[PDB]
From a paper:
The bacillamide biosynthetic pathway is a common, three-protein system, with a decarboxylase that prepares an [name] substrate, an [name], and an [name]. The [name] is shown to perform dehydrogenation of the thiazoline in the peptide intermediate while it is covalently attached to the [name], as the penultimate step in bacillamide D synthesis. The [name] forms a stable complex with the [name] and dimerizes it. We visualized co-complexes of the [name] bound to the elongation module of the [name] using X-ray crystallography and cryo-EM.
Residue numbers in the entry:
A (entry chain B), C (entry chain B): 2 to 330
B (entry chain A): 1297 to 1435, 1439 to 1679, 1784 to 1861
Write the structure that this text describes.
């Protein structure tokens, strides 16, 4: 009945004269005597109570303060890590040959980009095969663009919204089938949608879980809502205009029992497969989409009532494309 | 309107899947609240709790408190709310003075394994003439006996005059030891609306975020809460979810409707107040825009099933106005004070030409425009840093002083709760957007300065 | 001029009575005195020579043996980790409620799959919106299947092969554009192809780097070749029949200077975007594709002469679909 916490794989450590270095912070007080044994103990999975019995030796108020902070600072966690924590140690392994001003200066970035778009692999030989551009590509692939401004008046028709979301549904035909691929055919991505008021015909505002087996939306949360402060500054106008928000969620229980940790990796790939699949059906239906890399997923995860085995990988904003005005409603 | 818990049961059958009450991460639907209040009501009856009894409940900001309250009413008994932050000696006084049998806290449904009791309907116990709750005021404190018939009349007319329905969402700011909360709990439920509970009522910044995050539509507080909250609000803020503002308690400042109209341009703000000694409310007067500005805001007309009088020394109506004492009558009147006959005989009297009346003690006059105006009631060293000086200056303007020691407790100048928020509000406005609470937990002037400045905006 | 090695983020540790536990192995000998300070030293990046000067104190042959083994066992690494090492610590965080026999028994798996395909999110409310299947989906999306057997006689026409690979090329139009999305428009996935002899008209066997700016293949390696023992048993017949192999490679230098570690995550998503985009152009051209989750990427990475900042994320086998026989050539 007690919660079991594990040491986060994303956190690396060191002992110090100052105190216990964990991540980018130095800690002081009781935690100095508990350590380093506490590190060893914590990878195995331990409760708050067991930790207190083993380390308290004194004020249980003094012991609870350090335990409360290690959980808050995400050194002790209750379930699978979100992607951003998974990849965080990689910064210490990548040697950056450019200046930081690429991120702070539009002029430094515009140059870094043009250099990366004309890059080649260094181990290339002096032979070439010029192919042929003569081919024709489907317009749904070649004309897809990221839409960051939407028609905020015309509601998405119930037929249009149903068609877009039918790209993700099941198909019974001697065996369950989707319209997109999935490592091992396990399809461990839960699909959620947030709909804004009056922006999708037939769908009241709120968070819904899309059940691909029924082809139905099932309400999760109509009380809370997504706001602009949940989004990065550069994306707040994208969200403001959009009719709905898609959230791609990895269900570890639908994957990891078979493929282990690689199933989490496969679901990140599958998220892109879903994203790209979506953006084509959208172009067929004159719906625009734009992928969102980061946003306050800690809040969205809470709104959707996700369990310990679910983490949000990706978000997409969507809506009808501009072409004509309408009566303001 | 029968009883309070019967209005909830009838509506819970209409919209069983509608959210009944929300706190933070777990909330109860109308069917869930009905099932768990039935289970606890049966548990109370197993302890001999029935008609004529009184049950103490702790007004913690948790959804379990809503279950206990509804379960006490379903058992036929009245509930007496107890503030968990009150000292033990004051909590004990009310519990013994009210002759309560037991005290219900949040440790009950899981502690007593009440999930095993029956969750079905219970054949009714309470009648509209029965007592629904006894609430103590003026802490020494005196309890007010409100019946089910009385509490339902106030609630039924608010919801029907303002068309409260399923789409509404009420923010639960007022503590349950104050009679205002009864509308936030029972008035919300009788219309199929959702109640959002607030963890800390003096966290003005959280109150603002809660209104925007959860689409709050109804605001029901003392006007002091709205005026203090809008002083933690930027000049470019605007919200369109709030559609009804019910203000009552203490005076109603003139600059406040200007703030309410500019930040909530769609909110119908209503100036009211009805004395706890009656059903909570008794007067109804919408801000009817503003075509009139002088020095005071008028009270209004009786809400419904209630009457108002400006009486002289022989209990006769003062002509064409005439400032005098204020009396009320009608279906909202309380039964009396609990176990105090002297105060009951003086306050609740019989009118020579009309039904029973209650003496509010307030003074006022009937304007020729038909509304009654409220005319009052009772007749008879040096700082060590630039940041410390700025913080002292705010303490100086709010508490009206000159120079203070940094170790002078914030209330050495008489500082209270309302002035504590006023201090941090002015600190918030000038660019110290941090902890606007923590004014009594940290006596040192500097300790507050280290807590309010830095970081701030972003 | 010396190589700098870092402690692998994928490796967690503990001290022991037996010796130094690193990963799933216990180590003995000199390494016991060097530790734990060696751990602290190694996260910062250290050479073999500097390590010897600091820890040798004795036989430089005895010091080199332990250093050689920590590099071999991937405790000390020279560059970014491949995806499989990135995600490996996640196994200790996922509590598996099923039995291991799902992986060993076709009957246990067939049941686990059907349970995961009829799963729902647990926090669902009792409201439903039945949508509409009445829509029509493009055949290129709805008819795509994973093709694991190919026409091994008819060569892929040079026009067909050029068209498929034109989905990944650049388009100059006031600004460089692709036919697929990329976080920040940085497009950090290098695309490589291995072509089997005689299976693609116009393309000699060998490893090529596809340059999207020229729309050209540039040879990297014609000496080595991919063989069936480089593939998992369950995939060897897929590879045997296929005409070519696609390899999706993350170029950290084209991404991480801007987005940090999240750019590695974004490239995994982008790999799926590319994979899915490819599998549709293929269906338009009656080419079949099948994604490959794992394979001996350590060898392929070596054949392609990848640098420290490049790791292989994904592989795809491709070829013409069966429909008619031909003369055996
Ligand atoms: P700190 O931690 O202590 O800070 C928090 C505090 C407690 C300061 C603050 O958060 C707080 O007050 N919180 C409690 C919530 C709240 O609103 N409590 C007030 C009780 S509501 C109840 C009061 S009453 O009207 O019955 N009082 C009766 C009496 O008041 C006079 N009166 C009220 N409104 C009037 C108007 N508009 N005009 C003239 N007089 C008014 C009358 O004399 C009346 O008889 C209300 N809601 C029920 S009526
Ligand atoms: C993972 C991901 C996240 C993105 N996030 C944003 C974003 O936050 N804001 C934005 O304006 N575009 C965003 N984009 C859009 C692309 O970075 C880029 O602008 C564009 O999609 C490249 O091709 P396109 O312009 O044809 O769409 C994102 C794309 C991806 C793949
Ligand atoms: C990342 C990934 C790896 C896959 N690896 C294999 C594989 O090794 N062998 C195989 O036969 N199918 C493999 N597949 C195919 C799918 O797991 C699955 O069989 C099929 O694609 C599901 O839809 P479909 O049958 O319509 O293609 C892989 C798919 C993905 C997405």
């Amino acid at each position: 009945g007690e919660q079991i916490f594990y040491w986060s794989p994303a956190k690396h450590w060191r002992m110090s004269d100052e105190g216990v270095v964990i991540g980018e912070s130095t800690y002081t007080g009781m935690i100095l005597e508990w350590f380093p044994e506490f590190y060893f103990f914590a990878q195995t999975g331990v409760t708050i109570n067991r930790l207190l019995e083993r380390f308290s030796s004194g004020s249980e108020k003094e012991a609870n303060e350090i335990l409360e902070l290690l959980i808050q600072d995400r050194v002790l966690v209750e379930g699978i890590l979100p992607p951003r924590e998974v990849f965080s140690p990689q910064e210490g392994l990548f040697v950056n040959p450019y200046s930081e001003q690429i991120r702070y200066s539009k002029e430094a970035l515009d140059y870094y980009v043009s250099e990366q778009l004309n890059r080649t692999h260094a181990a290339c030989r002096s032979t070439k095969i010029q192919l042929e551009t003569s081919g024709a590509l489907p317009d749904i692939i070649q004309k897809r663009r990221s839409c960051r401004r939407f028609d905020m008046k015309t509601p998405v028709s119930f037929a249009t919204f149903s068609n877009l979301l039918s790209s993700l549904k099941q198909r019974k035909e001697d065996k369950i089938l989707y319209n997109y691929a999935s490592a091992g055919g396990l399809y461990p991505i839960d699909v959620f949608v947030y709909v804004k008021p009056r922006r999708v015909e037939g769908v009241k505002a709120g968070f819904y879980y899309f059940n691909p087996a029924d082809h139905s939306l099932v309400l999760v949360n109509n009380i809370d809502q997504v706001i602009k402060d949940d989004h990065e500054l550069i994306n707040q106008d994208i969200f403001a205009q959009s009719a709905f928000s898609v959230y791609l969620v990895y269900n570890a229980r639908a994957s990891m029992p078979k493929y282990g940790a690689a199933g989490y990796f496969y679901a990140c790939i599958e998220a892109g497969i879903i994203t790209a699949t979506l953006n084509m059906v959208a172009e067929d239906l004159n719906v625009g989409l734009c992928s969102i890399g980061h946003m306050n997923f800690e809040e969205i995860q809470t709104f959707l009532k996700l369990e310990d085995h679910q983490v949000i990988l990706h978000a997409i904003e969507g809506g009808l494309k501009i072409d004509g005005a309408a009566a303001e409603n | 309107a029968a009883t309070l818990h019967q209005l909830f049961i009838d509506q819970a059958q209409r919209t069983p899947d509608q959210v009944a009450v929300v706190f933070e991460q777990e909330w109860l639907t109308y069917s869930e609240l009905d099932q768990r209040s039935n289970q606890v009501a049966r548990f109370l009856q197993s302890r001999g709790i029935g008609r004529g009894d009184r049950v103490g409940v702790l007004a913690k900001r948790q959804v379990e408190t809503i279950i206990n309250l509804m379960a006490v009413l379903k058992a036929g008994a009245a509930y007496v709310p107890i503030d968990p932050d009150h000292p033990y000696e004051r909590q004990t006084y009310i519990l013994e003075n009210s002759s309560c049998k037991i005290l219900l806290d949040s440790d009950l449904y899981e502690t007593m394994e009440i999930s095993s009791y029956a969750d079905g309907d219970l054949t009714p116990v309470a009648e509209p003439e029965d007592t629904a709750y006894v609430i103590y005021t003026s802490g020494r404190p005196k309890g007010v006996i409100i019946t089910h018939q009385a509490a339902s009349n106030t609630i039924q007319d608010i919801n029907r005059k303002f068309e409260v329905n399923e789409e509404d969402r009420i923010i639960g700011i007022s503590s349950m030891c104050f009679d205002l909360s009864v509308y936030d709990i029972f008035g919300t439920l009788s219309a199929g609306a959702t109640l959002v509970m607030i963890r800390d009522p003096r966290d003005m910044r959280e109150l603002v975020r809660t209104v925007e995050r959860r689409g709050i539509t109804i605001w029901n507080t003392v006007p002091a809460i709205m005026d203090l909250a809008l002083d933690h609000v930027g000049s470019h803020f605007e919200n369109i979810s709030l559609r009804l503002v019910l203000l009552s308690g203490d005076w109603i400042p003139l600059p406040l409707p200007a703030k309410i109209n500019r930040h909530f341009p769609v909110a119908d703000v209503i100036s009211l107040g009805g004395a706890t000694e009656a059903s909570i409310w008794s007067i109804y007067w919408p801000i009817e825009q503003v075509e009139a500005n002088w020095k005071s805001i008028p009270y209004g007309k009786p809400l419904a099933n209630q009457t108002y009088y400006v009486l002289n020394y022989d209990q006769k109506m003062c002509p064409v106005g005439v400032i005098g004492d204020l009396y009320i009558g009608g279906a909202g009147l309380a039964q009396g004070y609990l176990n105090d006959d002297q105060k009951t005989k003086d306050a609740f009297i019989m009118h020579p030409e009309f039904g029973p009346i209650y003496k509010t003690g307030d003074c006022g006059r009937m304007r020729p425009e038909g509304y009654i105006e409220f005319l009052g009631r009772q007749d008879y060293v040096a700082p060590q840093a630039g940041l410390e000086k700025i913080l002292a200056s705010v303490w100086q303007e709010v508490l009206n002083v000159e120079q203070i020691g940094a170790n002078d407790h914030f209330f050495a100048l008489g500082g209270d709760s309302i002035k504590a928020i006023q201090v941090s509000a002015r600190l918030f406005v000038q660019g110290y957007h941090l902890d606007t609470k923590s004014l009594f937990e940290f006596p040192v002037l500097r300790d507050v300065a280290r807590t309010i400045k830095k970081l701030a905006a972003a």
